[PDB]
Amino acid sequence: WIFHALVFSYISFALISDKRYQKKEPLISSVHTKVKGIAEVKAEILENGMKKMVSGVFDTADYTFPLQGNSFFVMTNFIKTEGQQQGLCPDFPTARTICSSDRGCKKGRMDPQSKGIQTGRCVVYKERLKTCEVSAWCPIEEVKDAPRPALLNSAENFTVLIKNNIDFPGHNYTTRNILPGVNITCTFHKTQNPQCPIFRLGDIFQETGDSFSDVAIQGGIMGIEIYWDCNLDGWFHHCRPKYSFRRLDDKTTSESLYPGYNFRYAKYYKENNVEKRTLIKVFGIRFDILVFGTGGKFNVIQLAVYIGSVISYFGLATVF
Amino acid sequence: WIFHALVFSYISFALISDKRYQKKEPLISSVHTKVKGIAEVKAEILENGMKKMVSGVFDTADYTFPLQGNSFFVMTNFIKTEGQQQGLCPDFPTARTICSSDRGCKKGRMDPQSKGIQTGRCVVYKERLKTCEVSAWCPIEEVKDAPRPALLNSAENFTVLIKNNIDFPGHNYTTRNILPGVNITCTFHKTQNPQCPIFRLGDIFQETGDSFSDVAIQGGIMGIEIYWDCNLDGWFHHCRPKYSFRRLDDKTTSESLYPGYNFRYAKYYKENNVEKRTLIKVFGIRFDILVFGTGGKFNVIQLAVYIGSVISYFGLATVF
Amino acid sequence: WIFHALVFSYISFALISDKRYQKKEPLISSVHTKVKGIAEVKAEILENGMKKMVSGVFDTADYTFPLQGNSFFVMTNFIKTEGQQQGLCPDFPTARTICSSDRGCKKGRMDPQSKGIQTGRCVVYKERLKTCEVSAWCPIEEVKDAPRPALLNSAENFTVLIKNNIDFPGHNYTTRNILPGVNITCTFHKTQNPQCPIFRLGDIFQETGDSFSDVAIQGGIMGIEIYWDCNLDGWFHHCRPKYSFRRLDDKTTSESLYPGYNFRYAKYYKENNVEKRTLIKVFGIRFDILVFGTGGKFNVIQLAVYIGSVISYFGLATVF
Ligand SMILES: C[C@@H]1c2nnn(-c3ncc(F)cn3)c2CCN1C(=O)c1cccc(C(F)(F)F)c1Cl
Ligand SMILES: C[C@@H]1c2nnn(-c3ncc(F)cn3)c2CCN1C(=O)c1cccc(C(F)(F)F)c1Cl
Ligand SMILES: C[C@@H]1c2nnn(-c3ncc(F)cn3)c2CCN1C(=O)c1cccc(C(F)(F)F)c1Cl
Numbered sequence: 001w002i003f004h005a006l007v008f009s010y011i012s013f014a015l016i017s018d019k020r021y022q023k024k025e026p027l028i029s030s031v032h033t034k035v036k037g038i039a040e041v042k043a044e045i046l047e048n049g050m051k052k053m054v055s056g057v058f059d060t061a062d063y064t065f066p067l068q069g070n071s072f073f074v075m076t077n078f079i080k081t082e083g084q085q086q087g088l089c090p091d092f093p094t095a096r097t098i099c100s101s102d103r104g105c106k107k108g109r110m111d112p113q114s115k116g117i118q119t120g121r122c123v124v125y126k127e128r129l130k131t132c133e134v135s136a137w138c139p140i141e142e143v144k145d146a147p148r149p150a151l152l153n154s155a156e157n158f159t160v161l162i163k164n165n166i167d168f169p170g171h172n173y174t175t176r177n178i179l180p181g182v183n184i185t186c187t188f189h190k191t192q193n194p195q196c197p198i199f200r201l202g203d204i205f206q207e208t209g210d211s212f213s214d215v216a217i218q219g220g221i222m223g224i225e226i227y228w229d230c231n232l233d234g235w236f237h238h239c240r241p242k243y244s245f246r247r248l249d250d251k252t253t254s255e256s257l258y259p260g261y262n263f264r265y266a267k268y269y270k271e272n273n274v275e276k277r278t279l280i281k282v283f284g285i286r287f288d289i290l291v292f293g294t295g296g297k298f299n300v301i302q303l304a305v306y307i308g309s310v311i312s313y314f315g316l317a318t319v320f
Numbered sequence: 321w322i323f324h325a326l327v328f329s330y331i332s333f334a335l336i337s338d339k340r341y342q343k344k345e346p347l348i349s350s351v352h353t354k355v356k357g358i359a360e361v362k363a364e365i366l367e368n369g370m371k372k373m374v375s376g377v378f379d380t381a382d383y384t385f386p387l388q389g390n391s392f393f394v395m396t397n398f399i400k401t402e403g404q405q406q407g408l409c410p411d412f413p414t415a416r417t418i419c420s421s422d423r424g425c426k427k428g429r430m431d432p433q434s435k436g437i438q439t440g441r442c443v444v445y446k447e448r449l450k451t452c453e454v455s456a457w458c459p460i461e462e463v464k465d466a467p468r469p470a471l472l473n474s475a476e477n478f479t480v481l482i483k484n485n486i487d488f489p490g491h492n493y494t495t496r497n498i499l500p501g502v503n504i505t506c507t508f509h510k511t512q513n514p515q516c517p518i519f520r521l522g523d524i525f526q527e528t529g530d531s532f533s534d535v536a537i538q539g540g541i542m543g544i545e546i547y548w549d550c551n552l553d554g555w556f557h558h559c560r561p562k563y564s565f566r567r568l569d570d571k572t573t574s575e576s577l578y579p580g581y582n583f584r585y586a587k588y589y590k591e592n593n594v595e596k597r598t599l600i601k602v603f604g605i606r607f608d609i610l611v612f613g614t615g616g617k618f619n620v621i622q623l624a625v626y627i628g629s630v631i632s633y634f635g636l637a638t639v640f
Numbered sequence: 641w642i643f644h645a646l647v648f649s650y651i652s653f654a655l656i657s658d659k660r661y662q663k664k665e666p667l668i669s670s671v672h673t674k675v676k677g678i679a680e681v682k683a684e685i686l687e688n689g690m691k692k693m694v695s696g697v698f699d700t701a702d703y704t705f706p707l708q709g710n711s712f713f714v715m716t717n718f719i720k721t722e723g724q725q726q727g728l729c730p731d732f733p734t735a736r737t738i739c740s741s742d743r744g745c746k747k748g749r750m751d752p753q754s755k756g757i758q759t760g761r762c763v764v765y766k767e768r769l770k771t772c773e774v775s776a777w778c779p780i781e782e783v784k785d786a787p788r789p790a791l792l793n794s795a796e797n798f799t800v801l802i803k804n805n806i807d808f809p810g811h812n813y814t815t816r817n818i819l820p821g822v823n824i825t826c827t828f829h830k831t832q833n834p835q836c837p838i839f840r841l842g843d844i845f846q847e848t849g850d851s852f853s854d855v856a857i858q859g860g861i862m863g864i865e866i867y868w869d870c871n872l873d874g875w876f877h878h879c880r881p882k883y884s885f886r887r888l889d890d891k892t893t894s895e896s897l898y899p900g901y902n903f904r905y906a907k908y909y910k911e912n913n914v915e916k917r918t919l920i921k922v923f924g925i926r927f928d929i930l931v932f933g934t935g936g937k938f939n940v941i942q943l944a945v946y947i948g949s950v951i952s953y954f955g956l957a958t959v960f
């Protein structure tokens with residue numbers, strides 16, 4: 001007869017822990033972010049074998065874009081090429097693009113590593129070096145790695161404020177990330193301040209486990225997961241978020257898979273009645289905000305179904 | 321023996337109402353929107369203590385961007401500053417940025433309310449007023465409230481057409497929000513026309529409960545929830561959407577939390593061989609389209625499981 | 641007594657096939673795409689009744705934008721209008737905008753098919769043709785169809801590489817689309833190579849069922865569904881994706897519903913100290929990446945609940 005009570009105790013433990021008496025429903029989320037911080041860029045680079053100085057001040061309008069699709073982008077490094085115009089120009093000296101005569105490459109060939117339409121004419125590029133010219137924007141962008149000191153390294157000091165509004169459409173419940181009457185002067189901490197939504201990017205990378213400088217050198221992808229485990233029952237009601245960080249970057253470190261996060265941005269203008277384009281290769285950090293959760297509310301039908309499923313179980317337990 | 325029939329009646333009530341005989345599947349959605357309307361802007365503003373006239377016509381290409389991430393943006397107000405260039409300039413007179421001598425502020429200090437790198441030199445700004453200069457884009461943008469009459473108030477008359485395509489991957493079912501052979505000349509109404517997807521922004525604000533002018537003064541965020549409650553069984557098949565509107569804005573009304581929705585847009589160009597930037601502080605309404613739903617189809621396994629779980633229930637009910 | 645074994649056989653059938661012993665949890669996805677390919681555009685068009693030649697080379701920075709909201713856009717056709725400035729100009733000759741005298745149209749009228757504010761003055765447009773002028777950007781963009789040969793037809797030869805990172809937050813499981821030590825030189829095939837994520841757009845349209853030329857003529861919307869059916873149990877562990885393609889475009893083919901996918905892009909500049917705008921009507925293909933799935937792991941509670949639910953079932957089966 002002791003088993004008759006042990007089974008009932010296990011049933012009660014299951015009902016309490018698993019919350020089998022509640023209907024659980026998914027979450028509908030909306031995110032709004034604001035990034036603040038200014039960076040003083042001052043460095044020296046080598047463009048086309050010539051030393052150049054990059055100096056300036058970047059404010060919020062110079063390194064980011066408004067949030068779109070629960071994600072915002074923070075720019076950290078750039079390579080600029082100015083004065084490009086459509087025409088004919090030799091390709092960059094490379095093993096695939098090198099030639100000794102015009103027969104080395106054929107007209108109309110398209111190479112994956114090239115940004116021009118080949119025309120088959122091996123012209124001298126520089127210092128008795130011959131490459132076969134292509135029809136594209138000229139001059140061809142120099143193939144170089146990102147600067148070894150990150151240009152916008154101070155971006156590790158920027159602060160992002162996140163507002164999350166969640167709704168459970170089946171129930172009549174909607175709430176927000178920032179409750180009224182809460183401090184707005186915060187720097188997020190795992191234990192000291194786990195609820196104020198102001199995050200520091202360097203702190204995010206510190207908790208996750210990487211170094212901000214190395215990632216910002218070639219860009220990357222990170223994600224801020226906001227988990228909502230909400231109990232909406234009147235007796236025990238609690239609906240608060242939990243913040244975690246996870247690097248979504250693949251860390252391929254292989255040139256064939258395009259490691260890191262980067263893209264190309266184009267600005268078109270006119271000079272001396274000639275159309276021109278300037279190309280900025282931008283390396284940055286892409287922050288995703290993955291908001292997930294569920295909400296449970298008491299339901300009579302679910303409780304009845306669970307009790308019915310348990311009734312035969314403990315009946316057999318008594319019988320056996 | 322009457323309880324033996326009452327339990328069975330409740331059994332059938334639960335089975336019919338809760339649809340316990342149906343496997344339920346989430347929804348995969350795709351949204352495509354088109355916003356139309358032109359606004360004639362004509363007003364007078366005060367920039368740097370001087371009266372200026374803003375007059376023009378804004379078409380679809382001048383106040384919105386293509387939909388990205390199930391959300392589109394509608395511009396409603398702006399503050400323009402043209403002719404900025406990198407250099408040294410005094411900051412705007414403010415309690416934090418004010419000084420009587422050069423010792424008031426230190427070089428290299430960064431202030432959250434300032435957009436420049438401080439250099440520590442208290443120079444005259446205007447009319448025997450001294451502030452310590454910073455290195456940034458100059459002249460520093462004037463911090464002022466949005467114009468009391470909303471510039472793009474006529475944006476309340478714009479019309480948005482929404483096309484939603486939903487799919488249930490587990491089942492072989494996909495459908496669209498606009499069925500064939502339906503009127504395309506519509507203005508959405510709660511009761512008169514609840515299925516045609518052409519919405520008027522002013523009407524959205526009217527059903528939601530706010531006023532378009534006040535929200536458009538400082539921006540805001542709304543969400544157009546499209547709920548799909550679809551029964552895919554052949555006997556009783558119905559898959560139609562229901563439209564609701566909900567304001568996702570936090571309505572903080574506190575300057576520390578950045579009330580409303582706004583951002584900064586930058587346009588870079590060259591003038592007299594000098595690089596320059598023009599900055600537009602844009603206030604607008606961000607419309608989100610939260611599409612959620614589920615689809616249920618008859619499943620033998622679910623029906624068998626429910627019947628088995630309730631068999632012990634009514635057996636005990638008869639026994640007791 | 642044979643039924644006593646048949647019921648148990650169906651019991652095992654349901655438990656094995658339906659995986660009723662597993663707790664199933666949804667998926668959290670992050671997508672990162674890279675599109676490559678250059679198109680040599682060379683064609684002749686008719687603008688304002690005059691023959692013009694469009695020739696150039698488009699690289700990755702000239703026909704696409706960085707991925708935002710699990711979707712990327714590839715431009716395929718464009719119509720350019722340059723030199724627009726704010727002012728008064730007659731509208732395009734149309735049945736709605738035609739007039740014989742100034743009384744034909746009234747000042748301030750807003751027509752849906754026009755992009756200007758009517759001022760009520762029927763002036764000559766061209767060759768003894770009278771339309772009433774409007775205040776807007778001038779000259780009014782010509783109402784013409786897209787060029788019959790798609791300008792960026794070669795966009796069917798572009799290649800897109802997709803990296804998907806999925807996480808099951810409830811369990812301690814995260815994985816990626818590209819496993820280590822796998823070939824990166826691929827062209828996706830239904831049977832020959834179903835796991836390498838390099839897709840050719842022409843191949844996507846071939847598997848889906850349409851022709852790339854017709855779709856690219858007026859634009860369209862497509863979706864690449866990545867389905868993750870993952871079993872995380874140690875005995876039988878497999879978590880691999882399956883790729884499918886589906887056209888999300890409505891295919892309305894009715895002018896009132898705006899068939900295809902297109903938008904208007906604006907570039908603002910200054911010429912001779914006069915503000916000017918150039919408008920590009922862009923037709924392109926919007927690729928969506930709908931990632932969905934679920935992950936199941938063994939749970940004792942679910943197994944106990946299913947066993948309790950089915951115990952009464954087979955008990956009645958024996959009794960009956
Ligand atoms: C136009 C060019 C540009 N175009 N897009 N874009 C961009 N990229 C990615 C984004 F997420 C947002 N914005 C930028 C960045 C700033 N840009 C600048 O010229 C610039 C501005 C300030 C200071 C300096 C300095 F320090 F070098 F002198 C420069 Cl060079
Ligand atoms: C370049 C500047 C600009 N840059 N971005 N942008 C923008 N902002 C947010 C978006 F969602 C989309 N587009 C705008 C708006 C229009 N712009 C204008 O100059 C302009 C155009 C027409 C009429 C007038 C008028 F009435 F003032 F004379 C002006 Cl001032
Ligand atoms: C500025 C203008 C422009 N502005 N935005 N934009 C755009 N649209 C949609 C996107 F998804 C991304 N980018 C474009 C495309 C290229 N553009 C060009 O001028 C251009 C460039 C190269 C060759 C030629 C050629 F062949 F005609 F000579 C031209 Cl005409």
Ligand SMILES: *[C@@H]1O[C@H](CO)[C@@H](O)[C@H](O)[C@H]1NC(C)=O
Nearest residue numbers: 152153154155156157158202
């Ligand atoms: C970030 O700020 C701290 C002080 O708040 C400063 O010591 C540090 O140098 C800054 N980071 C960079 C990259 O300059």
Ligand SMILES: *[C@@H]1O[C@H](CO)[C@@H](O)[C@H](O)[C@H]1NC(C)=O
Nearest residue numbers: 181182183184185186187193
């Ligand atoms: C915020 O925190 C400060 C100290 O960090 C504390 O003195 C203050 O009471 C808190 N609340 C408000 C509203 O400032």
Ligand SMILES: *[C@@H]1O[C@H](CO)[C@@H](O)[C@H](O)[C@H]1NC(C)=O
Nearest residue numbers: 472473474475476477478522
């Ligand atoms: C919107 O249109 C109505 C007429 O359709 C007009 O009376 C009203 O003034 C317009 N709104 C604004 C802000 O002008």
Ligand SMILES: *[C@@H]1O[C@H](CO)[C@@H](O)[C@H](O)[C@H]1NC(C)=O
Nearest residue numbers: 501502503504505506507513
């Ligand atoms: C659309 O509505 C009008 C009146 O609002 C009605 O006369 C017409 O029959 C409806 N259907 C179509 C296809 O126009």
Ligand SMILES: *[C@@H]1O[C@H](CO)[C@@H](O)[C@H](O)[C@H]1NC(C)=O
Nearest residue numbers: 792793794795796797798842
């Ligand atoms: C795409 O490439 C193939 C060869 O790889 C070529 O035959 C075809 O003409 C190209 N497509 C277009 C539209 O030129």
Ligand SMILES: *[C@@H]1O[C@H](CO)[C@@H](O)[C@H](O)[C@H]1NC(C)=O
Nearest residue numbers: 821822823824825826827833
């Ligand atoms: C890739 O495929 C080629 C042939 O398609 C094969 O020879 C090679 O072994 C594969 N793996 C690698 C790593 O190249």
